[PDB]
From a paper:
The well-studied Siphovirus T5 has a three-fold symmetric tail-tube, to the end of which three long, L-shaped fibres are attached. These fibres are made up of a homotrimer of protein pb1 (pb stands for “protein band”). The L-shaped tail fibres are responsible for the initial recognition of certain Escherichia coli (E. coli) host strains, binding to the O8- or O9-type O-antigen of the bacterial lipopolysaccharide (LPS). The bacteriophage T5 L-shaped tail fibre uses an intra-molecular chaperone to fold, which is then auto-proteolytically released to yield the mature protein.
A single point mutation (T to G), mutating the codon of the corresponding serine in pb1 (Ser1264) to code for alanine, was introduced into the plasmid pET-28-pb1(970–1396). Expression of the mutated gene in E. coli cells led to production of the non-proteolyzed version of the protein, which we call pb1(970–1396). The resulting model was used to phase the structure of pb1(970–1396) by molecular replacement. Three trimers were located in the asymmetric unit, and the intra-molecular chaperone region could be constructed by a combination of automated and manual building in the calculated electron density. Serine 1264, the residue responsible for the auto-proteolytic cleavage of the carboxy-terminal domain from the bullet-shaped domain, is located between the bullet-shaped and intra-molecular chaperone domains. In the structure where Ser1264 has been substituted with alanine, the chain continues with a loop (residues 1265–1276) winding around the other three, subsequently forming a hairpin (residues 1277–1322). Three 50 Å-long hairpins (residues 1332–1371 from each monomer, containing beta-strands C' through F', protrude upwards and embrace the preceding bullet-shaped domain). The intra-molecular chaperone domain (ic) ends in a central triple-helical coiled-coil, to which each monomer contributes their carboxy-terminal alpha-helix (formed by residues 1371–1394). In the structure with the chaperone, two short beta-strands are present in the third interdigitated region, forming a four-stranded beta-sheet with the C′ and F′ beta-strands of the chaperone domain. Although the interface between the bullet-shaped domain and the intra-molecular chaperone domain appears extensive, it is only 3 × 103 Å2 large and the association is accompanied by a free energy gain of just −12 kcal/mol.
Residue numbers in the entry:
A (entry chain B), B (entry chain C), C (entry chain A): 989 to 1296, 1304 to 1396
Write the structure that this text describes.
């Protein structure tokens, strides 16, 4: 039944495991320094090893400068024997916790306790060891996961992942803690192996302080970052600013939509602001006579059309192209006529239902290669307008007006 | 004071718990196979059970094919007795870690160690058991949470959640690791009970590889996904591409803004590109005489207005509607005249300060029902322009030009 | 070798630590109630304290109403002695798990087991204690982190963080579980110290239920939220709705782009919808003669320009400004002429490669102060159009038409 150690005097009641190296030498790296474990009864014998256990192990060979030690907990899956038991919890000597469930690592890697030791055991892995000592690492086949199960009760289901930024340190005698500083960030993103190693994140969401904080001001922003094909460095692309503006994170560089991914429409209050600054342009030349002629002819093409229930006003780019060429102009040297083309490509179209193999089941779809003819209607309207101006000036001269 | 087991020869110093079933039968499922626990002193006695403890338990009845075993750690909240102690840490036999703090589960569920065993104990729960063996599960009343506390020291507060994608396996007899493959994703999202069960995520942010990776190319994208009312399958909606484009994830399907959520304004460098492709349209018919007449009359309505202060150029939709109808036209059959209506609805307007009941405190607001009359100004300009064209052609004929 | 406790009768085989206060008084808050620990061999002695250990400790002074107790696990980093061992795993009496790796907290704080106890030990910290009992807390210098290592095997690398919403409770006798309710949210965001305390999140991504759920309907939305300079309350800014619309979360409040962060261009199918509602405007006045005169003159400026290879149609704002002023008008009282200026500011331009000090290495860049002259081309076209209308009416009167 019950075995116990008692100290009646007010001191500690503690159990110790004492272990040596061979022939009184120092204890070694990964040597089992101590253990506690259950052995269940099979009917007439106990198991030969523990089915659940706590192990104390060495971290490096013991010496006057190294007393390194780490911990793991071992479990045995239902339906398996102690030959297939799993060191699923490993508390590294650096203080990190590794969670390595059944199926994640071969039993040859049962002594891995860090990125450094994992790199050594799997030479091609090459993850950054600067990530050691930072907290929790989960290794699982395919889909390592954190589930936050949140019953509402009488309030709200509101799971959360919360960074807590501050100035200062909990590591010294002083323990100053102060206001969040500029450059405070929280990245939620993905690193990956590139064929040679893992490195920095190449895609992420980042919540950032937008300046230093004070009791009346705690500004932030949220930024989405991606890495381009043929490149190995991620860039901030789009973000929401402290004032709520949704903006590209570089000027005159990123689009909204593309040929095979067009916005259906925009609801705005004010008109789009387009820069038309003399300092960024060459001189504005007058239109040639063929250009003016084409401008006049294009105005005659304006009518009404439908798609394949309302009547839309305008013309086709193909019609404008024929008119342009009939006056000897190359239509694609003009900014109001656009052509976009794209290759065949595959996209996630939807998600299947959860099944026996996983909960997240993307359904793929192939988008055929294609192309579009398009206008910039603001610039087209101005082209047409110059046509009207030339026609009006010709009339005004004929009436000495 | 101090109790110890010593092995001087270089072997292990290990403690074992040996337990049987009743009458020498096999140990049973959830049977306590071993235990270590503290019992504090009340003045003249010790507590009847341990206030903090490590338990080794069976996972399934022991047999020649099952040596299953799992672990939990128990703690007792300050201000409570050992009747209310909490098995807060449960290392499942599958290797998952369950964190179940005080107030999360009734004591009847102290032996729950998996989604399978939780489903059996709570028949209406019905979570997917495919999620077992994947890592960490946290159960807490209302707001299970992970906090990443990040003192700056002399650097930057930069907490991070990092997926680490790779090809290969750590699980086999030979380990192999290679470059991130196509279809690599990282989902941060929410599943929920639908009245019958939990299933796949129905809203999420997803970081994805955009193609396979190599040492000179590690492309990614970030995608936001939601599920529609009346639907049970989430779809990618908007995303930032590897090249930084912000785009809808299906063509000609999603809007920017709506009637009661209009963008204030857009800053663009180039003019909006609108597709005007003959292949997607029916034939462009000429304008009837009433339509041309309305186009001419509408041009006379252009003046300057202010809101209720710069002078803006244009006219009202209501004025255009009267003119349209005065020539016997239904104005709402034309694409340049729009009407939007919305019901009364309630939204989160802001967040209150943290209080004794929670840190996240949304303040609600009711938006009244309403409607708007709107133009598509690009189309309207073209309608007006055809009016000018007809007037110019009528003049040119009268002067034999 | 092997030390063991055996129970042949079918009962438990358990080890107990029995400890008292001084002079038979009750055990005290944070008193070591029990311990298990390895002591490695240095060559001729063992270490004076354990290099790896499990400790059971008191939570509050023991009494008839308090049997509080908690657990920690201690490890010793390779290259250090037991003077510098780390209580890296602390399972609080409330059931929370604290991960505190090497370098995170001074050894004086080794008994911290909660936000309440941390606040008392570090008076300036002032985090919200309502966060106690919610799950996992990770403290690390600068960059606490969670890594999800996901080898593809034969499937896909698909790590996930998954909130699981439901109605009900697992905490009571009743244990009702039901459908996800309205107001269910999942926040991924950042709190921070403001100089006095930590509080609510001030920037975040939030996945939210958009209404209650049922077996045929599980709507969601994704929202990005930030806090403004000079403010201490975060607001929803932009979101993707259940129907996939990307929208500002308040009407007529937020922009897309700004002067130093302009969208390059927009790809839309339909024309931008601009509200032009008589009910929201003052009366549309007719143009004065100087305004009409300027409108006519501006049409003559339309030609072609290039940036510093295609020919773009239009004119400069500076040219329009001179014409406006030549007829005695203030050009900046008119909505189609815009001027924006911005101060010098610093932004993250790029991410450096991973180095020995960290994986996430932002490279900064200074954007000089600057300004732009811009048009609203839709409004400008209408201004020009009125010029044409006045010219046509003058001709028609002269020919008695």
């Amino acid at each position: 039944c019950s075995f116990g150690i008692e100290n009646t005097a007010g001191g500690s009641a503690v159990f110790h495991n004492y272990t040596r190296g061979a022939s009184n030498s120092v204890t070694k790296n990964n040597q089992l320094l101590g253990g506690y474990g259950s052995r269940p009864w099979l009917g007439s014998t106990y198991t030969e090893h523990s089915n659940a256990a706590l192990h104390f192990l060495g971290a490096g060979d013991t010496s006057a400068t190294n007393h390194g030690g780490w911990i793991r907990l071992l479990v045995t899956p239902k339906g398996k024997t102690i030959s297939d038991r799993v060191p699923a919890f490993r508390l590294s000597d650096n203080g990190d916790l590794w969670l390595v469930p059944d199926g994640a690592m071969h039993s040859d890697l049962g002594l891995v306790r860090s990125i450094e030791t994992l790199n050594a055991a799997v030479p091609r892995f090459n993850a950054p060891s600067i990530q050691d000592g930072r907290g929790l690492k989960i290794v699982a086949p395919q889909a390592p996961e954190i589930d936050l199960i949140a019953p509402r009760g009488s309030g709200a289901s509101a799971p959360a992942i919360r960074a807590m930024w501050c100035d200062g340190s909990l590591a010294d005698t002083t323990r100053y803690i102060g206001a969040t500083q500029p450059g405070s960030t929280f990245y939620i993103g993905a690193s990956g192996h590139d064929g040679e190693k893992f490195d920095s994140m190449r895609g992420s969401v980042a919540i950032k302080s937008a300046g230093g904080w004070g009791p009346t001001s705690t500004p932030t922003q949220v930024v989405l970052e991606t890495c381009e094909s043929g490149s190995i460095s991620r860039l901030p692309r789009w973000g929401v600013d402290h004032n709520g503006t949704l903006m590209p994170m570089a000027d005159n560089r990123y689009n909204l939509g593309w040929g095979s991914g067009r916005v259906k429409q925009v609801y705005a209050v004010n008109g789009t602001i387009n820069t038309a600054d003399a300092r960024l342009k060459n001189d504005v030349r007058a239109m040639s006579d063929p250009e003016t002629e084409a401008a006049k002819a294009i105005a005659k093409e304006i009518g009404f059309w439908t798609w394949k229930i309302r009547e839309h006003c305008g013309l086709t780019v193909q019609r404008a192209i024929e008119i342009m060429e009939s006056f000897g102009l190359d239509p694609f040297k003009y900014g109001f006529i656009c052509y976009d083309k794209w290759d065949e490509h595959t996209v996630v179209s939807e998600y299947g239902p959860a099944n026996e193999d996983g909960t997240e089941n993307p359904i793929y779809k192939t988008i055929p290669a294609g192309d579009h003819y398009s206008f910039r209607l603001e610039e087209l309207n101005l082209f047409i307008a110059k046509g009207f101006e030339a026609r009006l000036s010709a009339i005004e001269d004929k009436l000495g007006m």
